[PDB]
């Protein structure tokens, strides 16, 4: 229990230097980075709830010393902080795997390897040491390194009313552990810490929707998925999708006519979007330009409801009489041109010259249209890269940057009447911002507190790599309103499994 | 002769504990974070051209590990590295100034100090021990310690070549250095190093003219001052005048258009702007809406000049009858009003009724204006803290982020006509967020490169404080233009009379 | 780690656990450059005594990465050590910090204590503060944790005026339990570690705070009105609407004294005089333009106060034409005094033009058709006459320039701000007489006569001050919170806006606590 896999020493006799760490960073206890997790009586057995590489960035002081050094050797001394209670009893499962091991998918080939059994009862200050399974005399950074496993083996059950428990852990370097070569302080290894700069959200972009102010953050029940394509960012890769990191720039587009129109009760005629990054139009390029609207108005009513746009005729340096006309994504009465994020559109324009430029700002949406409507994007098929839909893990919900668009009316015969709608937009560029300065621990959520009545109300969100925010609620309503106050901070990173204690009622 | 003052060796009675380095540290030199500096014959006499303080801040390690501790103690050691040749007559000199003493003007003061003296020829690298000056225990952070100061002790008088030397520093700490009281490592001083993005400016943001992305990098030998109140943002203070960091979402405002007008062939009709940050209108806060428009018209033209924005009316859910009007600031007769950047304005619309709600969009330029025109913003006056004038060092240019804006035109009496212009910004917001995560060094401006061609042309900018970059130009010209494929690159820390090396030849 | 003790409760259901823990060493002092050492009494260094702001309350809603409590280790942490430290010049020594703690064996949850170095920021996270030397506690088995705090330093000795080091602690894992009002209390206690010592005596009369205040039994009916005086207080009042204050004679700070336009002698300063300058207003009337003498500020610069030392602050309303006027006695100045004094109606600045309006300038309106030019009239107050009620008296007009007025405040939220009443009377006139006020209220923040006791006895640095209210002879009881800025503040659950309170008085003076603390009474507004 207190050591399931002998750790075996290595001399380091084929190290150029030996660099010894200070004594006392050997002495005192920290909380493992991203070591913390929770159970619940929910949890079903055999999921994974921690799984850490036996690496420097167990403990934070030799995380921050790692960034110096391009060589390491030695292993850990954990230590597991239960915060239980006298009524619940379930039993959990800590594994060490050997390196270029698959990682099992169940508790009981789990048991195969080194292994020990924890119960709820008895667990709280165990004791476990993760030694560190090596090939060469000591590692390089970028090697495959072996990795601890915690799984639920018994699930949590309650005489009394249930309570969850969380669970902490805790380490320090073994006695043998050493750096080496002693490199500019630039690695790629991840900080333990992050610094956010102060930034209230309304100081920051709306990517779907420029040219309106971040009103408030927003949480709402319907909104169970999320399938745009503009407000994606993510830390490993950046934009995602057909995101852009200056949403003003890229709102506008052009597009040419083009022959032919479809039925309606006035005129419905055609158009195709330019593509400047895609000259040829080939199958693995995004099918329209960078940064342009992705609204979705309809499944199929292409006429009771109808995107609204400035449109104008082109002419040397410049355009003539530009004026708001309806229009909108495919030619309708079809599967894949319709309601799909591709190249040809129509416009509702009476007389539009062949073969002639045209420009296309998205504005507002019109008709029957509501904020329901818009959210739901434009499906994309083919093989370029588009984002994929996500969803937030059971009991959560998303939090969204929610703008106000105001509507446009005219007495003459211009063409349309908009009507107010709200956009939402699930992440920012902003707050993406200073995340790639230090990257993410692999496989672990930063937990960010945001704090709003000068640290009167303090609010807890997740905030994945994959670049959306969640909330835990014990309600789910639409209404919900967050202030733009603003002022978020990094509190620690978590187990993606991790459930946020504090919890905001919706329905009320 | 290389230790004119020796190093005290505290015997640490009172640091609860005594945190060793690792003795692989003690032997390695690494560059001084901004000792770099130039020398010429146009150098003034008695002038401080170097002034660090002695601390744990001169070395790369020991600036990365000092962010883990609370205390330290012990000195330095230092070398200096001259870039001259075999013409270059004149002499240096090195002195170490004890806490709380002033520094002299003139090197022959100097010599009443330990010092040490140098002469440009020589190519070795000369060493000088810097020790640790207190009657204290050992240091905490905000404490007034001793300086290391190099001043020209026999000045350049050969003038054959005539031609920069350039001098940099490497330290080492002393055997006995030692840190103390482990602490977990955030702080809020300066980062060594400046990892920047890897964004090309054409995805940066234009703050005076969002929607039209950035096209190009300007130099404008003619531009010799700026006055805008827009793209302004400073290290130390973040936004500065009437900027944001949301230029797209302030873009827009409104005015109540209240009684009277001015004489014009047409007729021109008041208006006040609205000031939500600034309800009552004290004198103390910015007169206008955050982030509005500075473009600047002209100096004295109702004729010729003016501005042409989308404008509509107020209703219930939005606006009504939105198009093109021109309008300006302040009325043409009179003086400190004409053009002041303050809250009444021009309308040219016959039909605008009485204290009533609009919307504006700045959208554009009409009449004879170019693009000197709007280059110079209106004056301001008051005591609402404006952004001050700036110009570059002698010898330097700006560098400006330039984009296109297309004119607008119309073939029925929709009423104006705009006309292609070029809108430059001082510096882009998203350029500046990466710094303020990674503050910089007091006093101290940034060198950075800027790669082109797969790195077969690189370009050298200074990057300052205070908010703008300019560059080393020989020749005379007023339409330079530099590519925006992009990818700023960190290079160093310089003082703010550096020299870069890197010329840029306007005659082509 | 250095010893720990288990006893079991009685029932033998639990266990409760006693530890004593030195997280950092301590460095002790060889004192080689006093040139005294002067000993303690050896008696004070066995007394625990509480350390004022050392209470705080743990519940299932509080969050872990909330500090609950911050105290620097110096001498005001025992009651004994800071009242000798007013004979001394310097000092040396730590301190055993003692956690008390109510735990049960049926809860859950864990806390964390830690020792910040001087000169370190405090973090915001429990994660960040287990890089310090810390220790954590669980509260099925808590019962007391002693601390043996060093202190920290790089010199022989302190003198006064240097950074310290600090405790702080936080929750670590979040309180449960089955019932829905349990709670955890915690509280320290504090005494000098046997090394501790004082130097070079000298004679009792320093700045320092007084670790504890004596209030003098006054009551609040028998203490002055800034902002009306002539008429008693005659209750307290709390009321929902009122979330801020922007009063100027009222103001009242523990340090720099008075603030903005407050004096310490509000009768005395209530009168003024004027010049009556050219020009007038439109009106049914006819109104008139007066400036005022500033005998304080001769030379009419931005950098002093624009208006005459503690004059006047009811405030009229945004817009009033012929609704909502001020009323005062005016009469021209004639040798040794002044003639045919008598009730006028007058306001702040023109009316239509805006930063005059409703502003602190010489500016005033008069009604007076025949104010003589350029002669010099007297002013009194009085009162308010037309549709002003309460809320229109109660907002003052705005302030600006440089000339550091006094700042707009609001209450932390959950909680009321505490005013002094009292009843304006109303003037009628039967013949021309020419004007006609009406009955209204004035609410005054705070009264010098309280805070000029506290002047006497500072506030510890970064403390607020409890106070008990007696009413009854002992058998009500009420609590507010008096902060160093000026003014007071109750706990509230309620909603009205007409609560009253008798003006009994006894003031009393409980203990020291945090800004965030959370007083226990609580006072139901809707009864």
Chains 1, 2 share one sequence.
Not at 167 to 178: N, V
């Amino acid at each position: 229990v207190t050591a399931p896999l002998p750790e075996a020493v290595s001399s380091l006799s084929l190290a150029p230097t030996v660099n010894a760490l200070d004594p006392w960073v050997y002495l005192n206890q920290t909380e493992v980075p991203g070591g913390t997790f929770t159970v619940s009586s929910a949890t079903q057995p055999g999921s994974v709830l921690l799984e850490l590489e036996i690496s420097p960035e167990l403990n934070l002081y030799t995380s921050h010393l790692f960034r110096m050094y391009a060589g390491w050797s030695g292993g850990f001394s954990l230590k597991l902080l239960v915060a239980g209670n006298a009524f619940s009893a379930g039993k959990l499962i800590a594994a060490i795997i050997p390196p270029n091991i698959e990682v099992p998918n169940s508790a009981y080939l789990l048991t195969g390897f080194p292994h020990e059994i924890l119960d709820f009862r008895t667990a709280d200050s165990m004791e476990i040491i993760a030694p560190d399974i090596k090939n060469i005399d000591y590692h390089f950074r970028g090697d495959k390194l072996g990795k601890l496993v915690v799984m639920v083996y018994s699930p949590l059950r309650s005489t009394s009313a249930d309570f969850e428990i969380e669970i902490k852990l805790t380490s320090a370097p073994l006695p043998d552990f050493k750096f080496t070569m002693l490199v500019p302080p630039i690695q790629n290894n991840a900080l333990p810490i992050w610094s956010i700069p102060q930034a209230p959200p309304y100081s920051m972009v709306n990517p779907r929707s420029p040219l309106t102010p971040v009103v408030e953050l927003y949480i709402n029940s319907s909104y169970a998925t999320c399938n745009h394509q503009l407000g994606r960012y993510t830390i490993y890769q950046g934009a995602i999708g057909n995101s852009t990191f200056n949403p003003s720039g890229a709102w506008t587009a052009t597009c040419t006519a083009e022959a032919g129109s479809v039925t309606g009760h006035p005129n419905w005629r055609y158009a195709l979007l330019d593509l400047p990054d895609n000259p040829t139009f080939d199958p693995t390029l995004p099918p329209v330009p960078r940064g342009f609207c992705d609204w979705g108005s309809g499944v199929k009513s292409g006429n009771k409801q109808h995107l609204v746009c400035f449109t104008g005729k082109k002419v040397e340096g410049g355009f003539q009489d530009v004026d708001t006309h309806m229009w909108d994504y495919g030619d309708n009465e079809t599967v894949g041109l319709d309601n799909t994020y591709q190249r040809t559109i129509y416009i509702k324009d009476p007389s539009l010259e062949k073969d002639a430029q045209y420009l296309v700002i998205p504005m507002g949406v019109s008709g029957a249209a509501n904020d329901d409507t818009v959210q739901v994007a434009p499906n994309c098929y083919g093989s370029w890269d588009y984002a994929p839909t996500v969803a937030p893990p059971l009991g959560e919900q998303f939090v969204w940057f929610r703008s106000q668009l105001p509507a446009s009316k005219t007495t003459t015969t211009s063409g349309v009447n908009s009507v107010p709608v709200n956009v939402n937009a699930l992440m920012s560029p902003d707050l993406m911002c200073s995340a790639y300065a230090s990257g993410f621990p692999l496989g672990k959520v930063a937990l960010l507190d945001y704090v709003l009545f000068g640290g009167s109300v303090v609010r807890q969100f997740k905030l994945y790599p994959e670049g959306y925010m969640t909330a835990n609620t014990t309600g789910s309503n639409t209404g919900f309103i967050i202030p733009a106050d603003g002022y978020f901070r990094f509190n620690s990173w978590v187990s993606p499994s991790f459930m946020i204690s504090s919890v905001v009622d919706l329905n009320l």
